[PDB]
């Protein structure tokens, strides 16, 4: 009779940086996706491979809730087959993705007068991420041919950059909290069902 803990994913007190995006595994519970879709707090709510109205009546084996924070103009990168700093180096969705992407403007929570520098993103990386891959390394990016030996400087970049996140920022540069629900149909007893 357990309700799925969607509250502690969406209404979580603090969110993770996009490079270290948090993942919650939902299993053995009953959830109502209609109430999520009913809520008008969300500015983005696009589903892929499945419709939201036919989501509270389909059983899945596991549901993964990935949550992180990015800025406005990067929200469009959280989709199958997109390019950019976020989709390439931080959080990549597969092309056969089956799930929904939810986002809402969190400028009232994630902005400081003077700048919130706690939310980071990976700016340099030698190659693109596989779908659903997380890279939390803090190694110096060797851009040139000379090795860096863990010394920051010329052709030796720090791989993480911080968002500005000031209240006076434009909407495209304001923080957005993203929750990506992915549904998997493992050949197994489907526990996560809708009601």
């Amino acid at each position, epitope marked *: 009779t357990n309700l799925c803990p969607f509250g502690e994913v969406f209404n979580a007190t603090r969110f993770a940086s996009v490079y270290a995006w948090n993942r919650k595994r939902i299993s053995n519970c009953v959830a109502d996706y209609s109430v999520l879709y009913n809520s008008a707090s969300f500015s983005t709510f696009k589903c892929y491979g499945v419709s939201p109205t036919k989501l509270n009546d389909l059983c899945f084996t596991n549901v993964y809730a990935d949550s992180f924070v990015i800025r406005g103009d990067e929200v469009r990168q959280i989709a199958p087959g997109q390019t950019g700093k976020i989709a390439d180096y931080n959080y990549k969705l597969p092309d056969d993705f089956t799930g929904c992407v939810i986002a809402w403007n969190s400028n009232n929570l994630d902005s*400081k007068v*003077g700048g919130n520098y706690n939310y980071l993103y990976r700016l340099f990386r030698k190659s693109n991420l596989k779908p659903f891959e997380r890279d939390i390394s803090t190694e110096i990016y060797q851009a040139g041919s000379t090795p860096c030996n863990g010394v920051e400087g010329f052709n030796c970049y720090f791989p993480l950059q*911080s968002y500005g996140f000031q209240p006076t920022n434009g909407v495209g540069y304001q923080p957005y909290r993203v929750v990506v629900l992915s549904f998997e149909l493992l050949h197994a007893p489907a526990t996560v069902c809708g009601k």
Partner: antibody
Amino acid sequence: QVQLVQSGAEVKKPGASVKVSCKASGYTFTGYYMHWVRQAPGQGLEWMGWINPNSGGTNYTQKFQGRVTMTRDTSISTAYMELSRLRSDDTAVYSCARDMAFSMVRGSFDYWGQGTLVTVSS
Amino acid sequence: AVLTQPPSASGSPGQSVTISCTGTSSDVGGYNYVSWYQQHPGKAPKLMIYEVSKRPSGVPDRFSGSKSGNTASLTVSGLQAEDEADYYCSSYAGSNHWVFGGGTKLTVLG
């Protein structure tokens, strides 16, 4: 519009220390490396070192190691340069210069501060 | 290790003048990261050339940079009165260090 506003002029005696500030505005302070350059009156430019306001890492040229200290406070977008054990020939205008490259150090400065005159008199 | 720069370069209005900047094989001749700055008296330096020959936006085409061996060169074609200032070259010197040149005063012969 980028603005690098430095602290006022300082008068010091040999053996003392000085702290110069450099508050940035008009851009994401953590996005660009900050350099420190001094210029003695009538003489030429002299590179001192750099700091990354993002990571906090620094590098100093050899002649200033052991006497210079570069820090930053991201909450106020200010870079600091501290010179200890001052001598007469340390009298110069100290300036903070922003690296024009984004999140990389490449040694080309596109915005300068107005300078901070530091006079070490007898 | 300072970059050797001639003390005075000069020319008549409309003439072309070249300011040299001789380093070593571990700064000028080692990397293509030579810069040139223009400083009018009492004002902050202005970036005129970066990466040997590239011009920032707004810098006149009359200013052009080049490099041969351990010696870089800043050339000013069509010399004008407002070009009278001090010019410093810069270069990466390895080990995360940059270095300046001694400086050259460019005088429009009056």
